[PDB]
Coordinates of C-alpha atoms in Angstrom, one line a residue:
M373 CA -18.4 -10.4 7.2
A374 CA -21.8 -9.1 6.0
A375 CA -21.6 -5.5 4.8
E376 CA -24.1 -2.7 5.5
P377 CA -25.8 -0.7 2.7
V378 CA -24.1 2.6 3.7
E379 CA -22.3 5.5 1.9
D380 CA -19.4 5.7 4.3
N381 CA -17.2 5.6 1.2
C382 CA -14.5 3.5 2.9
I383 CA -13.5 -0.1 2.5
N384 CA -11.4 -1.7 5.3
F385 CA -8.8 -4.4 4.6
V386 CA -8.0 -7.0 7.3
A387 CA -6.0 -9.5 5.2
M388 CA -3.5 -9.5 2.3
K389 CA -2.1 -12.0 -0.2
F390 CA 1.2 -11.9 -2.1
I391 CA 0.8 -13.9 -5.3
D392 CA 3.5 -14.2 -8.0
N393 CA 4.9 -11.0 -6.6
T394 CA 1.6 -9.2 -6.8
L395 CA 0.0 -7.7 -3.7
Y396 CA -3.7 -8.4 -3.0
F397 CA -6.0 -7.0 -0.3
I398 CA -9.0 -8.7 1.4
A399 CA -11.9 -6.6 2.7
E400 CA -13.3 -7.1 6.2
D401 CA -16.8 -7.5 4.8
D402 CA -16.1 -8.9 1.4
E403 CA -19.4 -10.7 1.1
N404 CA -21.8 -8.0 0.1
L405 CA -19.9 -4.7 -0.5
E406 CA -18.3 -6.1 -3.7
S407 CA -21.6 -5.5 -5.5
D408 CA -23.0 -2.7 -3.3
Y409 CA -20.3 -0.1 -2.8
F410 CA -19.3 0.2 -6.4
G411 CA -22.4 1.7 -8.0
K412 CA -21.2 5.3 -7.5
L413 CA -17.4 5.4 -7.4
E414 CA -17.1 9.0 -6.1
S415 CA -13.4 8.7 -5.5
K416 CA -14.1 6.4 -2.5
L417 CA -11.5 5.4 0.1
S418 CA -10.1 2.1 1.2
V419 CA -7.8 1.6 4.2
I420 CA -5.8 -1.3 5.7
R421 CA -5.9 -2.0 9.4
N422 CA -3.1 -3.3 11.5
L423 CA -5.3 -5.6 13.6
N424 CA -3.5 -8.7 12.4
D425 CA 0.0 -7.5 12.7
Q426 CA 0.1 -7.0 8.9
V427 CA 1.4 -3.4 8.7
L428 CA 5.0 -2.6 9.5
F429 CA 6.4 0.9 10.2
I430 CA 10.0 1.8 10.2
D431 CA 11.3 4.6 12.4
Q432 CA 14.8 4.9 11.0
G433 CA 17.6 2.4 11.4
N434 CA 15.5 -0.8 10.9
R435 CA 15.0 0.0 7.2
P436 CA 18.0 -2.0 6.1
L437 CA 17.2 -4.9 8.3
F438 CA 14.4 -6.2 6.2
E439 CA 16.4 -9.4 5.4
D440 CA 16.4 -10.3 9.0
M441 CA 12.7 -9.7 9.5
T442 CA 11.9 -12.8 7.5
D443 CA 11.2 -16.3 8.8
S444 CA 13.2 -19.5 8.3
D445 CA 10.5 -22.0 9.4
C446 CA 7.5 -23.3 7.5
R447 CA 9.4 -22.5 4.3
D448 CA 6.8 -24.4 2.2
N449 CA 4.2 -21.9 3.4
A450 CA 6.2 -18.7 4.0
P451 CA 5.2 -16.0 6.4
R452 CA 2.0 -13.9 6.1
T453 CA 2.0 -10.8 3.9
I454 CA 3.2 -7.6 5.7
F455 CA 2.9 -4.2 4.2
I456 CA 5.9 -2.0 5.0
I457 CA 6.0 1.8 5.3
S458 CA 9.6 3.2 5.5
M459 CA 10.6 6.7 6.6
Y460 CA 13.8 8.7 6.0
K461 CA 15.2 11.3 8.4
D462 CA 17.8 12.8 6.0
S463 CA 15.6 13.1 2.9
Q464 CA 13.0 15.9 2.5
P465 CA 14.4 18.3 5.0
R466 CA 11.0 20.0 5.1
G467 CA 8.8 17.0 4.6
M468 CA 8.8 13.2 4.6
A469 CA 10.0 10.8 1.9
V470 CA 9.1 7.1 2.1
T471 CA 9.4 3.8 0.2
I472 CA 6.9 1.0 0.0
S473 CA 7.9 -2.7 0.5
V474 CA 6.3 -6.0 1.2
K475 CA 7.6 -8.9 3.4
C476 CA 7.1 -12.5 2.4
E477 CA 9.2 -15.4 1.4
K478 CA 11.5 -12.7 0.1
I479 CA 11.7 -8.9 0.5
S480 CA 10.0 -7.1 -2.3
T481 CA 10.2 -3.4 -3.1
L482 CA 7.4 -1.5 -4.9
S483 CA 8.2 0.4 -8.1
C484 CA 6.1 2.8 -10.1
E485 CA 8.3 2.6 -13.2
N486 CA 6.5 3.8 -16.3
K487 CA 3.4 4.4 -14.1
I488 CA 3.2 0.6 -13.5
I489 CA 2.8 -1.0 -10.1
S490 CA 5.4 -3.8 -9.9
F491 CA 7.5 -5.5 -7.2
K492 CA 11.2 -6.2 -7.5
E493 CA 13.5 -8.5 -5.4
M494 CA 15.6 -5.7 -4.0
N495 CA 16.4 -3.8 -0.8
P496 CA 15.2 -0.2 -0.2
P497 CA 17.4 2.8 -1.1
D498 CA 19.3 4.9 1.5
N499 CA 18.0 8.2 0.3
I500 CA 16.1 10.0 -2.4
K501 CA 19.1 12.0 -3.6
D502 CA 21.2 9.5 -5.5
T503 CA 18.3 7.2 -6.2
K504 CA 16.1 6.7 -9.2
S505 CA 12.8 8.4 -8.4
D506 CA 10.9 5.5 -9.9
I507 CA 11.1 3.7 -6.6
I508 CA 10.6 6.7 -4.3
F509 CA 7.4 7.7 -2.7
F510 CA 6.3 10.8 -0.8
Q511 CA 4.0 10.6 2.3
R512 CA 0.7 12.6 2.2
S513 CA -2.3 12.9 4.4
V514 CA -5.9 12.5 3.2
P515 CA -7.8 15.7 2.7
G516 CA -10.6 15.1 5.3
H517 CA -9.2 12.1 7.3
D518 CA -6.5 12.1 9.9
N519 CA -6.0 8.4 10.5
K520 CA -5.8 7.6 6.8
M521 CA -2.5 8.0 5.0
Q522 CA -1.7 7.9 1.2
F523 CA 1.4 7.7 -0.9
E524 CA 2.4 9.2 -4.3
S525 CA 5.3 8.4 -6.6
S526 CA 8.3 10.8 -6.8
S527 CA 8.6 10.3 -10.5
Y528 CA 5.0 11.2 -11.3
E529 CA 3.6 13.8 -8.9
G530 CA -0.2 13.5 -8.4
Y531 CA -0.2 9.7 -8.9
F532 CA -1.4 7.9 -5.8
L533 CA -1.6 4.3 -4.8
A534 CA -5.1 2.8 -5.5
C535 CA -6.9 -0.5 -5.3
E536 CA -8.8 -2.3 -8.1
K537 CA -11.3 -5.1 -7.8
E538 CA -10.8 -8.0 -10.2
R539 CA -13.3 -10.5 -9.0
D540 CA -13.1 -10.5 -5.2
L541 CA -9.6 -9.6 -4.3
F542 CA -8.2 -6.1 -4.6
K543 CA -4.9 -5.4 -6.4
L544 CA -2.5 -2.4 -6.1
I545 CA -2.5 0.1 -8.9
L546 CA -1.3 3.6 -9.7
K547 CA -3.9 6.3 -10.4
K548 CA -3.9 10.1 -10.7
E549 CA -5.6 12.0 -7.9
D550 CA -8.1 13.1 -10.6
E551 CA -8.3 9.6 -12.0
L552 CA -9.3 8.0 -8.7
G553 CA -12.9 6.8 -9.1
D554 CA -12.7 5.6 -12.7
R555 CA -13.2 2.0 -11.8
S556 CA -10.7 2.5 -8.9
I557 CA -10.7 3.4 -5.2
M558 CA -8.0 5.1 -3.1
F559 CA -5.6 2.9 -1.1
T560 CA -4.8 4.3 2.3
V561 CA -3.0 3.1 5.4
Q562 CA -4.0 3.6 9.1
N563 CA -1.2 5.2 11.1
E564 CA -0.3 4.7 14.7
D565 CA 0.5 6.9 17.8

């Protein structure tokens, strides 16, 4: 809740919101840090934790089953927001290609079309070969952190997912690796073993 006056240069997310097809993040200690951490934006990190079952990882063959991962009850409220990381086995024979999606009332897929972060009511592609790169991501590590994971668009190499603070919530934006820090912080995800 309360935040410490430290230069750990990392914000932790513990909750999310999906509003008008826009993805928001809630910090663990979003009472103090909002006006403390952001005096010296030296390309600082943020990471989301799966401590509330809010991050979903796909191994392979569950990728196309997103439709069946939704709820049918409490339709007036819809299910909580879950952030999805997909993986391919066929794409990137010498790496790892991914797509980013969110689960809610519907299944939403993240696009970086025109370097703009937007969500579309569509299922994820089967591969990166016959698919528009605008909706394809590549999986990268963070240079200095193992647990932290970051994503960049296929269309625009060097452009990574980032978070931006509007008033209290954080929203998902696209920023160049060199741009990160210009009123922005890096969005990362905590992996699992």
